[PDB]
């Protein structure tokens, strides 16, 4: 298992514009297009992202290319963020994937906001961090995915994904 396989399980794959769990226009492997309510504003973002007139539909290669970009952006955002970088540096390989996952879903700013849990991760207080991560809107809104990520933090293995 690796980051790509982990995120592909969490986000799934869709080749037509769809709405995410929050109601936002998305496509591919969890590629957020816009928070705007307009499907047209969504098709404009999509065409711009792909570089062609898509009419709201893309191919598998195009989905995977957006995904590759997004994973890279998640990682680079972590390494550039003063609050996240130190946590990342501190973790083992498996747990690093879990933080990338949270960032991919919620954005760097959002994760950076989990101040207390970040401190517990850095201190390697696994059980405590897991409990603290669960007291969140994130956990309450997407509980099965949050549990999977939390378990990865708690154990440092890919069991939740196997
Ligand atoms: Cl893009
Ligand atoms: Cl879920």
Domains (range + CATH), the chain: 1-162 (1.10.530.40)
Contacts (Cβ under 8 Å, ≥6 apart) of 73? none
- Per the structure block, which two tokens stand in for 114? 């989990």
Ligand 1 midpoint to CA 73 (Å) = 10
Ligand 2 midpoint to CA 142 (Å) = 4
Question: Could you tell me the resolution of this structure in angstroms?
Answer: 1.8
Ligand 1 midpoint to CA 130 (Å) = 32
Instruction: Kindly list the distances between the CA atom of residue 141 and the CA atoms of 21, 48, 128, 134, 146, in Å, as whole numbers in the listed order.
Output: 8, 30, 21, 11, 9
Experiment used for this model: X-ray
Q: Which of helix, strand or coil describes residue 94?
A: helix
Determine whether 11 is an active site residue: yes
Smallest-distance ligand from the CA of 150: 2
Determine whether 20 is an active site residue: yes
Smallest-distance ligand from the CA of 28: 1
Report the C-alpha gap between 148 and 91 in whole angstroms.
17
- Per the structure block, which two tokens stand in for 68? 């590759």
Instruction: Kindly list the distances between the CA atom of residue 14 and the CA atoms of 3, 21, 37, in Å, as whole numbers in the listed order.
Output: 19, 14, 19
Ligand 2 midpoint to CA 143 (Å) = 5
Report the C-alpha gap between 112 and 84 in whole angstroms.
6
Is 36 annotated in a binding site? The answer is no
Residues 104/7, Cβ–Cβ less than 8 Å: yes
Is 121 annotated in a binding site? The answer is no
Contacts (Cβ under 8 Å, ≥6 apart) of 81? 108, 112
Angle ∠(95,89,28) on CA atoms, nearest 5 = 55
First to last CA, the chain: 9
């Amino acid at each position: 298992m690796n980051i790509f396989e982990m995120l592909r399980i969490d986000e799934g794959l869709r080749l037509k514009i769809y709405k995410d769990t929050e109601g936002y226009y998305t496509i591919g492997i969890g590629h957020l297009l816009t928070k705007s309510p307009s499907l047209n504003a969504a098709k404009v973002e999509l065409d711009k992202a792909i570089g062609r007139n898509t009419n709201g539909v893309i191919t598998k290669d195009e989905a995977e290319k957006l995904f590759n970009q997004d994973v890279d952006a998640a990682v680079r955002g972590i390494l550039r963020n003063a609050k996240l970088k130190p946590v990342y540096d501190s973790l083992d390989a498996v747990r690093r994937a879990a933080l990338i996952n949270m960032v991919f879903q919620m954005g760097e700013t959002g994760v950076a906001g989990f101040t207390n849990s970040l401190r517990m991760l850095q201190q390697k207080r696994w059980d405590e961090a897991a409990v603290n991560l669960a007291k969140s809107r994130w956990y309450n809104q997407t509980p099965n995915r949050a549990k999977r990520v939390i378990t990865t933090f708690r154990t440092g293995t890919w069991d939740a994904y196997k």
